[PDB]
Amino acid sequence: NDIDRHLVRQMTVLSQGNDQYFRFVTRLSRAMDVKIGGGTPDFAPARQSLENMRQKLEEMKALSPGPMNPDISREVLSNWQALLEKGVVPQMQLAQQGSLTAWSEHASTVTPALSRAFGASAERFSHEAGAMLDN
Amino acid sequence: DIDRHLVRQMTVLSQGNDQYFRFVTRLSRAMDVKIGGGTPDFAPARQSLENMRQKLEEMKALSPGPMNPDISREVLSNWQALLEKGVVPQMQLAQQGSLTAWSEHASTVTPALSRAFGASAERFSHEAGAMLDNTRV
Ligand SMILES: [Cl-]
Numbered sequence A: 001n002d003i004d005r006h007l008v009r010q011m012t013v014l015s016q017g018n019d020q021y022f023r024f025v026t027r028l029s030r031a032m033d034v035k036i037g038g039g040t041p042d043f044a045p046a047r048q049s050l051e052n053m054r055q056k057l058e059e060m061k062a063l064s065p066g067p068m069n070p071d072i073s074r075e076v077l078s079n080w081q082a083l084l085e086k087g088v089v090p091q092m093q094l095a096q097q098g099s100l101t102a103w104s105e106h107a108s109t110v111t112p113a114l115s116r117a118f119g120a121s122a123e124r125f126s127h128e129a130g131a132m133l134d135n
Numbered sequence B: 001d002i003d004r005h006l007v008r009q010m011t012v013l014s015q016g017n018d019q020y021f022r023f024v025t026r027l028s029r030a031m032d033v034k035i036g037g038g039t040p041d042f043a044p045a046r047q048s049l050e051n052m053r054q055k056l057e058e059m060k061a062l063s064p065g066p067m068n069p070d071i072s073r074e075v076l077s078n079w080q081a082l083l084e085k086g087v088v089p090q091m092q093l094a095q096q097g098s099l100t101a102w103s104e105h106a107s108t109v110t111p112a113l114s115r116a117f118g119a120s121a122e123r124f125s126h127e128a129g130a131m132l133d134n135t136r137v
Helices: A003-036 A044-062 A070-097 A099-110 A110-131 B003-035 B043-062 B069-094 B099-133
Strands: none
Touching: A003 A044, A003 A070, A003 A099, A003 A110, A003 B003, A003 B099, A044 A070, A070 A099, A070 A110, A099 A110, A110 B003, A110 B069, B003 B043, B003 B069, B003 B099, B069 B099
């Protein structure tokens, strides 16, 4: 498998990126609760997930468009990019030197929308990939 | 192949997590409307709860597969607990109880269950990441 291996790697990185997103949200939330509970928040875990996500985006770019339709490949990288630059990077910065209401409003609306868009792109990418492999 | 099976499991787990986070937001908006003296629409929250339940069933059907049996088990038990003890009550309580129930249950009981699911999901992602990226030593 050469094309097959490439596809599976694209599916793998895409899944890993989406997973790092959930790790990031969950870890940032934990740290944020400690801040709300009059504590000292440790943002090293969440920053780790954020970086992991960006590195998986770099790994995805190096693999794309690969063997599939270049459009869906373009789609996934631009929505991944957006989720990072407009969602996760600003949301992290709000938790670190922003107000509580600004971080919570952004984390309850802005970042989610970007998440569902990237998630949608990822699901169609993987459905198309899976179909080709199962031919 | 092993990579595809792990990835299907990682994808079902993320989808489960996404559907759970959705559920919490979905239900909250329906309650603001109910608290605002309006006619709530529970159809969407029910959809998320049902999607969370469907993703658990799909996770079980794929497990343990190539993943360590202990980690696989932790994930399914914490997922199932979050659903049967956290999520389901909230929904049944949101359709009958008060702030003393749905709001109080959701702030005290659920979080603990949510936190355990998150710890298991981390344990899963870490081992999967090591297998997939040949990162282990
Ligand atoms: Cl591309």
